[PDB]
Amino acid sequence: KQFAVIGLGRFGGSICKELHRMGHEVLAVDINEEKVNAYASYATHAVIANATEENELLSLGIRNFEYVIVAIGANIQASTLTTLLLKELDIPNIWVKAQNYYHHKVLEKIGADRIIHPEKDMGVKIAQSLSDENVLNYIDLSDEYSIVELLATRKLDSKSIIDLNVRAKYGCTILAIKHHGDICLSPAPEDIIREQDCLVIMGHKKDIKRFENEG
Amino acid sequence: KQFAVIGLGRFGGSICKELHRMGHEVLAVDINEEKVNAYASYATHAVIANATEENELLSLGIRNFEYVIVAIGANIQASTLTTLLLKELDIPNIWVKAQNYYHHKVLEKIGADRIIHPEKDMGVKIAQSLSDENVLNYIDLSDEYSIVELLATRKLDSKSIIDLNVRAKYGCTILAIKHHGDICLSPAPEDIIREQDCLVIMGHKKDIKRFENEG
Amino acid sequence: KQFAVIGLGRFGGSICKELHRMGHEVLAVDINEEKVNAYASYATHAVIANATEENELLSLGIRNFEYVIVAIGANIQASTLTTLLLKELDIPNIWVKAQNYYHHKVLEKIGADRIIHPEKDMGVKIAQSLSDENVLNYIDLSDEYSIVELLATRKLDSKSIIDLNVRAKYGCTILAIKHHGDICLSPAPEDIIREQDCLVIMGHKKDIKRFENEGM
Amino acid sequence: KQFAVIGLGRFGGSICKELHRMGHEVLAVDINEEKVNAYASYATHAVIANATEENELLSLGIRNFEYVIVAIGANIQASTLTTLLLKELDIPNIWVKAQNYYHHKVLEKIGADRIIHPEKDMGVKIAQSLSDENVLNYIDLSDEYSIVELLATRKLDSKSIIDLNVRAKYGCTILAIKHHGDICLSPAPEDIIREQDCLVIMGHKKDIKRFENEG
Ligand SMILES: Nc1ncnc2c1ncn2[C@@H]1O[C@H](COP(=O)(O)OP(=O)(O)OP(=O)(O)O)[C@@H](O)[C@H]1O
Ligand SMILES: Nc1ncnc2c1ncn2[C@@H]1O[C@H](COP(=O)(O)OP(=O)(O)OP(=O)(O)O)[C@@H](O)[C@H]1O
Ligand SMILES: Nc1ncnc2c1ncn2[C@@H]1O[C@H](COP(=O)(O)OP(=O)(O)OP(=O)(O)O)[C@@H](O)[C@H]1O
Ligand SMILES: Nc1ncnc2c1ncn2[C@@H]1O[C@H](COP(=O)(O)OP(=O)(O)OP(=O)(O)O)[C@@H](O)[C@H]1O
Ligand code: NA
Ligand code: NA
Known part of the structure; x- marks a missing residue:
């Protein structure tokens, strides 16, 4: 199993550190130079690239990864354009981090295999403990x-x-x-x-x- | 039980909607005007205020809330100064959303009753399903x-x-x-x-x- | 005695120039390129680095300095995160420049050995001469x-x-x-x-x- | 004795609070709305005004103050233009907070009665205790x-x-x-x-x- 994580945030960076701990080949992709340098030691391969560009995405060998995780949940334009290229590139499994209800519907139309709401699912679970x-x-x-x-x-x-x-x-x-x-x-x-x-x-x-x- | 949620984000807004669904008195505090208007119907009381100011915090009647949730996880200065005022105001329960490991340690020193990592805990759980x-x-x-x-x-x-x-x-x-x-x-x-x-x-x-x- | 000054401002730059005048080994750390170039001749060693990063802080040999002065008094996030790393790195003496009353309390919780209010102490002394x-x-x-x-x-x-x-x-x-x-x-x-x-x-x-x- | 403090910063705000504690009539002038509201209770009179404008400066009754303190030490253009108007308005005592050596020389030419370096004087005194x-x-x-x-x-x-x-x-x-x-x-x-x-x-x-x- 080869994993690619696009976007090294609080949610994306946790997947890279957890999968590398278990002993998996993880590709860390981020547009920010400082994010890539911090997670260079926590990933098998870390590249500074823009996932919205098809030419940059093909330079990573992204067609060789079964699971690609698009952990971008604050830029809808960057998140939806990234998964459109991956769906066009025939990625078997695309997991996308969404922002709101409308972002969930756009990803469902353009072919997201799984849509994740990290903050929304935790907010419901935390509120159950609060009540x-x-x-x-x-x-x-x-x-x-x-x-x-x-x-x-x-x-x-x-x-x-x-x-x-x-x-x-x-x-x-x-x-x-x-x-x-x-x-x-x-x-x-x-x-x-x-x-x-x-x-x-x-x-x-x-x-x-x-x-x-x-x- | 009276709940106050400071910061209406993806994590903060999920707590307000879930607690209001269960039938609880929720105070929604945010510095952004558009966030307060969106969650005005999903909270008992929604106020546009800055939580880093003691004068604005006392105008909300924040001393009457047993549980105060500081759901700010991208501004360390705003998150740590908010919980310092609440700890000085003798809030029985303060739950803070953290950003990284260093933000976790600062909140532990200044008296956070519970520190939450929504994206980090979901990233570990998602990576277990990926593996x-x-x-x-x-x-x-x-x-x-x-x-x-x-x-x-x-x-x-x-x-x-x-x-x-x-x-x-x-x-x-x-x-x-x-x-x-x-x-x-x-x-x-x-x-x-x-x-x-x-x-x-x-x-x-x-x-x-x-x-x-x-x- | 080896001294490290983090933040080359009006208060931080005065400590570097005074300690270098007396003949002390001073490390000048600032995130601004122009500040480091100006104080390169007024310090034993001047480095352009971010003090909020542990990897950059360990590259300076900061564990070899007995006194570290965090002269950042306008960025609470940068000032409090810097002293947390230094306290974790077991610095014997950490002197921090604060901004207001709430910044003073955060530094006291996270282990500041001495907290300095340069503008507040001068404002009281000046007002005594004004009265x-x-x-x-x-x-x-x-x-x-x-x-x-x-x-x-x-x-x-x-x-x-x-x-x-x-x-x-x-x-x-x-x-x-x-x-x-x-x-x-x-x-x-x-x-x-x-x-x-x-x-x-x-x-x-x-x-x-x-x-x-x-x-009189 | 009537005192006017122009610029409510860390140095300017300390003069207003100390002089008001001793029982003096203090005029607090600042261009920032939030600074004036915070120091409204710590000054006899607090006005939101620009000191570089002669029309706004005459609206404050600034000719009735024996001591005027220009506590602006990060804007040389605002600090030097303020003291030029006060010197033209025949203020008996003008005390100015300077930034560097070149700012000290400009204020000396345009008639500053006393020039103060708060951070520089403390930095020398602190370094004596460090040595x-x-x-x-x-x-x-x-x-x-x-x-x-x-x-x-x-x-x-x-x-x-x-x-x-x-x-x-x-x-x-x-x-x-x-x-x-x-x-x-x-x-x-x-x-x-x-x-x-x-x-x-x-x-x-x-x-x-x-x-x-x-x-
Ligand atoms: N086009 C892009 N290609 C690659 N990485 C990107 C792109 N756009 C943004 N990123 C990176 O993705 C990461 C996460 O994005 P962002 O901060 O906008 O989302 P988020 O929902 O706030 O994240 P998290 O909750 O995980 O912190 C950041 O490190 C950002 O630099
Ligand atoms: N001082 C403050 N007082 C009140 N609300 C604030 C303050 N600073 C920020 N906020 C609000 O808190 C909310 C959450 O903060 P922010 O967006 O910076 O964090 P985050 O970790 O990226 O959020 P999320 O919950 O979406 O993951 C935002 O709506 C922001 O406008
Ligand atoms: N994380 C950081 N690491 C190192 N230096 C920093 C950092 N953040 C800011 N600085 C620098 O520290 C110096 C002092 O900080 P700043 O100017 O914000 O405070 P100040 O209270 O206005 O300063 P002063 O009153 O001494 O002029 C500046 O030159 C700034 O560029
Ligand atoms: N033209 C002006 N008229 C009146 N007040 C002004 C003017 N320009 C700036 N101020 C105010 O003067 C105060 C002090 O200025 P500033 O913060 O730039 O200087 P400083 O030397 O960094 O401050 P400090 O006293 O905190 O060291 C601020 O509150 C600022 O809003
Ligand atoms: Na988030
Ligand atoms: Na200053």
Whole structure:
């Protein structure tokens, strides 16, 4: 797998550093000279080039990369013209960072394989923690079911799993407990619930909220 | 709970729209006139003000908000001076959006309760999907254990749960199956695994990778 | 002693010229090309570099300097990020030029050994001379005692030291008299006070003001 | 005494706040709207005006002020044109903040009563403390004699005044000792010298340096 990242920003630079850490060949492309020099050591190859030019894009050997990431989310003209050239160049996978709803629709028309909203997806996840301080991190399996890593309160201290009727009343399944750095996968009845540690639970979205308010 | 969001960007504007959707009193503060007019309908109160000024900050009644979110991640001078005033004004919870590693350290010194890297955290999560196309969304319970929502391949088609020795060999637990829009929580042996649907699994980080390569 | 001065402004450039005059090894760092060329002859080593970058800061050998002066007082982002790198690099002495009260508090949190307000300290000293024209230069020993270099008026002309009851009534001690270029340290009774020359006095802050209004 | 300060900068704003604290009528003049609003409460009268215009300068009643301070030290054209109008308007006392050596000479030609270099005078005083850490604050009585407020070292601990032969050998007079917040004016023999407190001394410039190195 050969990866090309166009645009070394906060989002683009994180992909280059993470993929290079895992041991992948990453091409870092940016129009700014200072950005390329900073990420020269964090990428296999770093080039100062303009992605809106077809002649400069063909000089990079961009046709040899299966995955090309266009991490430009503040210049719609630069982002949409870059993916038009890549779609014309028959790139199998083009992942684009969008800015707003209208930028999402333009990329969908010109053939974006995946469109990413980094700030919008984090803003929704952060606001869920702001509304309810009991949650720490959640993953939406569907629109009605999710896995929520809850935080143990004072009333749940010194309580066994069998004492909590999550399975019968709330219809939720306890998944894991992070006992002060110790992690137990699929706890068996019964385990004592300690102080403010991570409590992983699984259930319906409305059913978990009932457990937070009541249990 | 009263929330104040300073800076209506891509990350700041997502928090205002999400918290207002859930039914919370949100104060939207931005120095740009066009940003405030766009988010006037998506916030309880929208004010055009400079957060670096103490006189303007006290005119907003900012001492009445438990949670203040400083979503400025491109101006270090504006972000650090804003949180210094809020820390001096005894705000119980200050959440700041950072830019880089050095911006993270300055906010930690001047008393930031939580520091958020929206683009950096998404860039790591996106790069995990780029490296392995089988994964769709994952949550890190710890540094060695995670819950990964996998994608079913062709070799797993028409296969029962008892056929897959994830519990014995790989030491991983199957959590949920998204059967073409139908979601089954904690499947019982045995369930037939269909085509390319979401397969939620739980196990050690190295153990899940063995299941992806072999199973 | 090796000194590094970051930012060649009106305040930063004065430190480079004064330390080089006394015979010290001074490193002059500035982001502006014209500033470095002007102070190239007034510093041991002058480099065009950005102090907010760790890679550029390590290329200067900045870990070999005991005293680093960050004389940036108009860019808070550049000033605070520079001192964060120096504090991370274990610089024994970091002296920072601040802009306002809020800039002073940020530098105190991130570990500034000394914070300097050049314009604010001069503005207070100048305003003391504006309010009272009799004073010329003063040093605050404490919040209630100071040494004030006064200016002799017409009523103090042809007056002896013993005639002035500064020691008994005002409780102030006359320290030195600059008699037209001639300086007398610790004058003995009695010395004739001439025309408008420098009269150094020492006493309580409220006691000196009584001498200016009544005696002077 | 009526004071007018033209230019509300770091140096100009300090004069307005100090003179208003002492109870003087201060006129604050600045071309920037935000500067005038900030110093409106710290001055008797604050006006947004351009000092280079004679019509605007006469609208302030500037002929009624004995002392006018032109605290502009980054715009030579604005600083020199302002003092030309004031000299033409017969202001008894004009104090100007200069920028460099060439700005000092222009103001001297066009009739500046006093020219001030705030950053240059502080830079010399700071560099004296940088070269010798024993000094704290000094005042130059002349080019060869000065009063230096020294810092007591470890070798001067538990030492009497009569033990130190400053009067005979070094020819210097000890003026005051700040004994941990207690200040003694003109100490009499003998007083014990404690740890790192302020030691005020008076003598020749070369004679004090000998005391620092030897005594
Ligand atoms: N035409 C272009 N070709 C290559 N790189 C470009 C081009 N235009 C912009 N870039 C670079 O892409 C990077 C990211 O762009 P930009 O800062 O506009 O987006 P962003 O949405 O603010 O980014 P992030 O949120 O990741 O910080 C920058 O380093 C910029 O220099
Ligand atoms: N001092 C300030 N007070 C209030 N709002 C400000 C201030 N400075 C900037 N803003 C606003 O905050 C918002 C976010 O800041 P900015 O665009 O600089 O950061 P960013 O990290 O690029 O944003 P994003 O959330 O889009 O990633 C912008 O709408 C900007 O106008
Ligand atoms: N990041 C930086 N690294 C090094 N030098 C810098 C940096 N940013 C600015 N400088 C330089 O530092 C010098 C002083 O900064 P600046 O002029 O902004 O402050 P100031 O308070 O107006 O200065 P002064 O009152 O001493 O004239 C300038 O010559 C400027 O070019
Ligand atoms: N023509 C003018 N009339 C009145 N005020 C002016 C004029 N031009 C500039 N000013 C103001 O004078 C003030 C000081 O000027 P400036 O900031 O350029 O000088 P400086 O030497 O850098 O300042 P500082 O006193 O902070 O060292 C500023 O607030 C500026 O807006
Ligand atoms: Na962004
Ligand atoms: Na200045």
